[PDB]
Amino acid sequence: SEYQTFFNPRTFGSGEADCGLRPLFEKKSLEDKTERELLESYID
Amino acid sequence: IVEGSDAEIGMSPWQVMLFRKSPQELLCGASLISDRWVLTAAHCLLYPPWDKNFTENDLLVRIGKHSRTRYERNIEKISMLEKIYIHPRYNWRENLDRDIALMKLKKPVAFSDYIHPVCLPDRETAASLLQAGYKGRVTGWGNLKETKGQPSVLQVVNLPIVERPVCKDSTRIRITDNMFCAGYKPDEGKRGDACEGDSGGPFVMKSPFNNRWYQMGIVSAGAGCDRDGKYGFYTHVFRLKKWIQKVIDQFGGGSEPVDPCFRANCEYQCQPLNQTSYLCVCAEGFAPIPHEPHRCQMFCNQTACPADCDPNTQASCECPEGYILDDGFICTDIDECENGGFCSGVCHNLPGTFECICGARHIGTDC
Ligand SMILES: *[C@@H]1O[C@H](CO)[C@@H](O[C@@H]2O[C@H](CO[C@@H]3O[C@H](CO)[C@@H](O)[C@H](O)[C@@H]3O)[C@@H](O[C@H]3O[C@H](CO)[C@@H](O[C@@H]4O[C@H](CO)[C@@H](O[C@@H]5O[C@H](CO)[C@@H](O[C@@H]6O[C@H](CO)[C@@H](O)[C@H](O)[C@H]6NC(C)=O)[C@H](O)[C@@H]5O)[C@H](O)[C@@H]4O)[C@H](O)[C@@H]3O)[C@H](O)[C@@H]2O)[C@H](O)[C@H]1NC(C)=O
Ligand SMILES: *C[C@@](*)(O)[C@H](CCCNC(N)=[NH2+])NC(=O)[C@@H]1CCCN1C(=O)[C@H](N)Cc1ccccc1
Ligand SMILES: *[C@@H]1O[C@H](CO)[C@@H](O)[C@H](O)[C@H]1NC(C)=O
Ligand SMILES: *[C@@H]1O[C@H](CO)[C@@H](O)[C@H](O)[C@H]1NC(C)=O
Ligand SMILES: [K+]
Ligand code: NA
Numbered sequence: 001s002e003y004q005t006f007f008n009p010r011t012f013g014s015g016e017a018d019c020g021l022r023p024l025f026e027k028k029s030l031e032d033k034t035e036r037e038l039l040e041s042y043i044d
Numbered sequence: 045i046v047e048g049s050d051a052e053i054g055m056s057p058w059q060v061m062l063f064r065k066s067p068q069e070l071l072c073g074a075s076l077i078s079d080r081w082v083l084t085a086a087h088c089l090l091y092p093p094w095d096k097n098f099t100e101n102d103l104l105v106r107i108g109k110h111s112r113t114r115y116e117r118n119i120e121k122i123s124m125l126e127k128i129y130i131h132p133r134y135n136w137r138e139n140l141d142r143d144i145a146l147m148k149l150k151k152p153v154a155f156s157d158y159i160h161p162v163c164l165p166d167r168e169t170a171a172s173l174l175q176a177g178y179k180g181r182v183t184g185w186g187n188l189k190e191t192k193g194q195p196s197v198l199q200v201v202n203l204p205i206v207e208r209p210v211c212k213d214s215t216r217i218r219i220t221d222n223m224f225c226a227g228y229k230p231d232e233g234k235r236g237d238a239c240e241g242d243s244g245g246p247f248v249m250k251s252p253f254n255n256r257w258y259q260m261g262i263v264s265a266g267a268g269c270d271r272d273g274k275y276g277f278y279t280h281v282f283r284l285k286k287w288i289q290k291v292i293d294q295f296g297g298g299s300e301p302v303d304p305c306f307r308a309n310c311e312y313q314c315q316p317l318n319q320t321s322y323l324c325v326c327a328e329g330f331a332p333i334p335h336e337p338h339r340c341q342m343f344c345n346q347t348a349c350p351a352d353c354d355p356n357t358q359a360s361c362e363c364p365e366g367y368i369l370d371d372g373f374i375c376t377d378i379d380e381c382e383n384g385g386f387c388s389g390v391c392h393n394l395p396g397t398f399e400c401i402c403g404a405r406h407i408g409t410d411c
Contacts, residue, residue: 001254006166007289011296013080013152020163020256023156024054032055034181037202038250041179 046270047236048201056183058162063104068361068369073184073245076161079152084244086134086145100125108158112185115370123149129291143264143279151385165258170282173249176207180249186241190269201236222283225275238276239269247278311340348376366396
């Protein structure tokens with residue numbers, strides 16, 4: 001998941017680098033039930 | 045959310061509930077972007093036509109929530125606000141142009157399986173994904189219909205972006221580039237929308253390039269909910285990144301008759317004790333303010349207490365300090381130790397407050 005940071009953690013605090021990855025999904029290689037729906041809208 | 049469904053547990057761990065203290069009530073959605081910063085809509089905080097103008101002490105931020113109403117002990121976390129920042133060109137008179145606000149938390153929040161921040165998009169992620177017919181996702185605890193129409197659990201729906209000419213021709217309000225709109229069209233035969241109370245929550249898109257969720261918008265406005273040929277409007281996050289950057293850079297580095305009662309001026313009630321002296325007394329479930337004994341306030345020794353809602357009302361609920369509303373119209377104590385944020389030392393919780401043993405012992409204070 002290549003993500004460059006934009007903010008300074010001195011002011012932003014922590015979290016940026018691992019943003020957007022869900023503990024109960026992405027971090028376990030699981031999909032939510034409707035996640036795919038969104039993927040397919042790009043395939044269009 | 046109209047025509048959405050129950051969110052799975054852990055599905056939107058960046059979802060933030062804004063919670064008014066007095067009275068105790070859901071105010072809005074918001075989103076978590078780091079351990080210190082929360083994003084939301086400016087009209088949630090400030091909208092003079094509805095006499096809305098909140099300062100920081102008026103609100104709570106509840107994170108990791110799923111149930112609308114249960115106080116989710118050992119899962120949700122409550123954060124207080126250090127400061128609020130509303131966009132200085134926020135146009136509430138006309139448009140809700142730049143319906144955006146930042147909220148800095150007193151202390152960093154502990155992340156967990158349920159609490160975890162969302163990404164903000166860069167120029168390219170925005171460019172590529174913000175395109176008609178691509179779908180994002182919206183979540184919130186708001187109304188289930190335009191016309192209880194309240195969900196017991198966080199709702200979710202996925203909605204396609206709509207192209208400007210159509211958004212534009214759907215409403216007489218001047219649409220700006222700081223907005224976009226989303227939702228199905230009448231002939232598409234699916235339906236869905238944000239509704240009142242979902243404001244401030246994120247519109248998110250999973251990037252197919254790096255598999256991360258990015259907040260592309262903020263639930264902002266619409267006409268009714270789920271109307272045919274009408275479309276919900278969202279604050280265009282990327283467009284306003286300029287400003288986000290600027291506030292975070294600037295402010296982010298932090299963390300005669302004979303009657304003894306004649307004289308009295310009691311807030312609620314006077315009671316005579318002697319013929320020569322009185323006592324200010326208080327309604328059931330209340331007590332005088334220890335240093336301000338002519339004035340009165342809610343009180344609880346215990347782990348839970350009934351809420352003082354307004355009698356004929358079925359709501360308008362107050363709780364004592366250090367308690368929060370809960371299922372059954374009840375105030376339950378907050379556990380400031382499980383929560384974190386209140387005590388660096390060794391913490392013992394207490395009903396209405398806590399004990400912090402600093403390394404001298406503090407009641408309701410840190411070090
Ligand atoms: C109906 O009627 C009445 C009418 O008003 C009403 O209210 C009364 O209220 C008081 C409560 O006290 C007040 O509290 C309110 C807050 O609500 C506050 O506004 C106000 O300021 C008062 O504090 C009741 O009285 C109670 O209070 C006193 C004291 O709190 C208490 O007993 C006293 O104990 C003292 C010792 O602890 C004792 O005095 C000591 O004497 C020795 C020897 O002289 C001294 O020793 C040395 O002295 C030298 C100086 O010479 C110093 O150099 C040394 O250093 C001293 N030694 C030391 C060790 O320091 C001591 O210094 C002391 O002086 C004193 O004699 C008392 O016995 C008393 O027992 C009560 O608890 C009233 O009773 C009454 O209720 C009612 O409320 C109304 N109706 C109802 C239903 O209640
Ligand atoms: C503040 C939010 O809870 C709420 C979200 C509504 C989303 N609706 C749909 N269909 N997706 N926003 C509002 O209620 C805003 C705030 C002030 C009034 N308002 C409106 O959306 C009006 N219905 C229209 C409007 C009024 C004034 C300025 C702009 C738009
Ligand atoms: C909002 O409330 C504060 C606090 O009293 C006040 O200073 C300010 O003028 C108010 N602003 C608006 C726009 O109503
Ligand atoms: C809290 O309750 C205890 C006993 O349950 C009581 O004695 C005490 O006075 C209470 N607090 C107040 C301010 O009345
Ligand atoms: K407590
Ligand atoms: Na619609």
